[PDB]
Amino acid sequence: DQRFGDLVFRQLAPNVWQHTSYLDMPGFGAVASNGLIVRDGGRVLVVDTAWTDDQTAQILNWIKQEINLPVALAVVTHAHQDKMGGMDALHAAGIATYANALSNQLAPQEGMVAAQHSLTFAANGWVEPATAPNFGPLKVFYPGPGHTSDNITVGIDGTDIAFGGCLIKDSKAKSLGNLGDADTEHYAASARAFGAAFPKASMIVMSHSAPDSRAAITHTARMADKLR
Numbered sequence: 001d002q003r004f005g006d007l008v009f010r011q012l013a014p015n016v017w018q019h020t021s022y023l024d025m026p027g028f029g030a031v032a033s034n035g036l037i038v039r040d041g042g043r044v045l046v047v048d049t050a051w052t053d054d055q056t057a058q059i060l061n062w063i064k065q066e067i068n069l070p071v072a073l074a075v076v077t078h079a080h081q082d083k084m085g086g087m088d089a090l091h092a093a094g095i096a097t098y099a100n101a102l103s104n105q106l107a108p109q110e111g112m113v114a115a116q117h118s119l120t121f122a123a124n125g126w127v128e129p130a131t132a133p134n135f136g137p138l139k140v141f142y143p144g145p146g147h148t149s150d151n152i153t154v155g156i157d158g159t160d161i162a163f164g165g166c167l168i169k170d171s172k173a174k175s176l177g178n179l180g181d182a183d184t185e186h187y188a189a190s191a192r193a194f195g196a197a198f199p200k201a202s203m204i205v206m207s208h209s210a211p212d213s214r215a216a217i218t219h220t221a222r223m224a225d226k227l228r
């Protein structure tokens with residue numbers, strides 16, 4: 001995997017890359033955050049911003065250089081900084097942004113810029129397709145409240161990659177990370193719903209670890225069960 005400015009990029013599959021940015025948090029130093037970049041025909045689709053506007057501009061620059069296709073749309077997976085910190089950059093590049101309607105409602109109070117468009121979901125978790133027009137291989141699933149009440153997840157058609165975002169931790173993880181906004185009562189169930197929603201997916205991309213096996217889902221759920 002490749003360094004570019006302060007960011008790191010790793011190709012996970014033919015038309016799927018994972019982007020990584022860092023933030024110095026005081027007392028623990030640097031923290032990595034992963035999103036996805038996806039080439040679909042003549043378009044590129046982004047899943048999650050970087051921590052900051054500048055890092056997200058860097059993402060766009062790298063897409064210009066390594067793929068040099070226009071960015072059709074971004075999806076952000078909940079209203080925290082690792083996932084929405086760079087909404088202004090995307091808007092300034094005139095890229096269409098999408099989030100959970102709840103994310104857009106929460107964003108002002110979590111100090112984020114709302115996306116331009118709001119996804120809504122069926123009772124079974126699946127995105128209403130009207131609200132996610134022309135997402136190509138991106139299948140968006142709302143697993144229920146866990147890390148945040150608004151956390152959403154994205155599988156990529158034509159790969160065995162699903163993206164858990166901050167919901168899923170790594171199979172050798174010691175805790176569940178920041179639970180200050182979390183739904184402790186439903187977290188295990190939401191992790192497992194994410195599993196069942198993408199049952200064949202075998203490469204689980206996450207916010208804060210390198211891609212992992214489905215034991216990430218299992219281990220995260222088992223960890224959440226001990227918090228209920």
Ligand SMILES: C=C1CS[C@H]([C@@H](OC)C(=O)O)N=C1C(=O)O
Nearest residue numbers: 031080081082166176177178208
């Ligand atoms: C490990 C951390 C601390 S750093 C990042 C934080 O970014 C603002 C957040 O989204 O809570 N998230 C997690 C997490 O449990 O996923």
Ligand SMILES: [Zn+2]
Nearest residue numbers: 080147148166
């Ligand atoms: Zn978060």
Ligand SMILES: [Zn+2]
Nearest residue numbers: 082166207208
């Ligand atoms: Zn996180």
